[PDB]
């Protein structure tokens, strides 16, 4: 009975759900790497990317400026979003934020966690997953097949 309802139910209601995401987003737009429960971090991820879309539009656009105010509680971050975050992402058209699952919380609450960040941040690189090198047994065999097929092609 909640089929196609993209949104979650968080906070004390619809408005509260909007105000909790405004705080994670402002922390993200400020620190560029923020932690939260997997559910809430994933809920924001859509909102996080769309700010860059408005930032790309530019300062002059009235709609971008107005939106950047409701979604940035601290008012020292609107200049940053437009003048450093937006220039960085001009080349890209998507994939602004990187989300990964940090182990469960060691709090006695034991909630699922995730770390969300902005790509190209100055902070130390996250321990991302690494796929096996082409030299590994299985990988090397496939490469031999590719060479054979490329010759056949």
């Amino acid at each position: 009975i909640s089929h196609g309802r993209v949104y979650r139910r968080l906070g004390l209601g619809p408005e509260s759900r909007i105000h909790l995401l405004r705080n994670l987003l402002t922390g993200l737009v400020r620190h560029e790497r923020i932690e939260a429960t997997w559910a809430r971090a994933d809920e924001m991820r859509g909102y996080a990317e769309k700010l860059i879309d408005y930032g790309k539009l530019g300062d002059t656009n009235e709609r971008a400026m107005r939106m950047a105010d409701f979604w940035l509680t601290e008012k020292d971050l609107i200049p940053k979003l437009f003048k450093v975050l937006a220039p960085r992402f001009q080349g890209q058209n998507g994939n602004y934020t990187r989300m990964l699952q940090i182990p469960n919380r060691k709090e006695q609450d034991r909630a699922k966690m995730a770390v969300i960040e902005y790509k190209g941040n100055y902070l130390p690189p996250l321990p991302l997953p690494h796929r096996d090198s082409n030299l590994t047994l299985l990988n090397q065999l496939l490469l031999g097949l590719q060479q054979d097929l490329h010759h056949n092609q």
Binding site: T136, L137, Q140, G144
Partner: protein
């Protein structure tokens, strides 16, 4: 009778091991330090000529025993079950290492050796099967190839698909049995005695002995089967999960003696392959690949 050949070789193998162990009296502790990235700085005191690299893994944890295939003793690859000789540095190599060159070769030789064992005992006692050698082929070759000479009476018969399927069942049976490889260093004089009947094996033994300053030779035993080993092999057969004898092709320049190249594929439990990927690699192996 072939059964007699296996017994005498087995007995010779046991005698060579017994003298080596008896040759070493008392226990002399030798210092070996862990040089790997994780768990660095650990130092094991081990028994000379008795302790094995597997024991070093046993102290650290069960993960090293399960996931370690080879060990780098002072920058050289050594079999996990091969006893240590002197103080050195030990580094364990898994399959998923960034530079698995040594691991791949060890697995490569290992699989083709199990292939040789299957062939000799697969034939009927009426016919005559002799093993010449297996050429060292890069893993990129797409399959491991063992050359086997056959009796003239079989020169007109080529195995069918059913015959190829039978070999894999025997190969899988060896894998299921989970027989550890036995690593032995043998002087040429003893090695010739164990394989005097096989002229090609004798010639191969001569080449190995000539290469080294001494007459030391490398002998590996898989249960009953005994054969010379080019390089360090996998500790156990169970390390293999997928196995397949792709096809066998007669060597065209075999006028004096007919030889058939037995080509197969295998993948370890670690690096398992999906069904569709397995088929494509299997098909490639059927193509005959020459030795460069």
């Amino acid at each position: 009778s072939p059964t007699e050949l296996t017994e005498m070789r087995n007995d010779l193998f046991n005698r060579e091991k017994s003298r080596q162990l008896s040759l070493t009296p008392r226990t002399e502790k030798i210092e070996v330090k862990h040089v790997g990235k994780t768990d660095p700085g650990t130092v094991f005191v081990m028994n000379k000529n008795i302790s094995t690299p597997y024991s070093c893994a046993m102290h650290l944890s069960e993960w090293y025993c399960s996931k370690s295939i080879l060990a780098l003793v002072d920058g050289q690859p050594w079999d996990m079950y091969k006893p240590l000789t002197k103080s050195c540095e030990i580094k364990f190599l898994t399959f998923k290492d960034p530079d698995p060159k040594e691991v791949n070769k060890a697995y490569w030789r290992s699989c083709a050796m199990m292939l040789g064992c299957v062939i000799e005992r697969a034939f009927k006692d009426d016919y005559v099967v002799s093993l010449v050698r297996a050429p060292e082929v890069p893993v990129i070759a797409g399959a491991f190839c063992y050359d086997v000479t056959l009796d003239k009476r079989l020169d007109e018969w080529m195995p069918t698909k059913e015959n190829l399927r039978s070999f894999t069942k025997d190969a899988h049976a060896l894998i299921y049995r989970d027989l550890p490889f036995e690593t032995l260093d043998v002087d040429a004089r003893v090695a010739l005695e164990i394989f005097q009947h096989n002229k090609y094996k004798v010639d191969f033994i001569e080449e190995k002995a000539s290469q080294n300053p001494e007459r030391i030779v490398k002998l590996h035993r898989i249960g009953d089967f005994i054969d010379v080993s080019e390089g360090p092999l996998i500790p156990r057969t169970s390390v293999c999960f997928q196995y397949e004898v792709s096809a066998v092709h007669n060597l065209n320049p075999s006028q004096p003696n007919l030889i058939r190249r037995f080509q197969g594929l295998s993948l370890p439990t670690h690096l398992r392959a999906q069904f569709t990927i397995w088929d494509k690699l299997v098909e490639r192996s059927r193509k005959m690949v020459t030795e460069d």
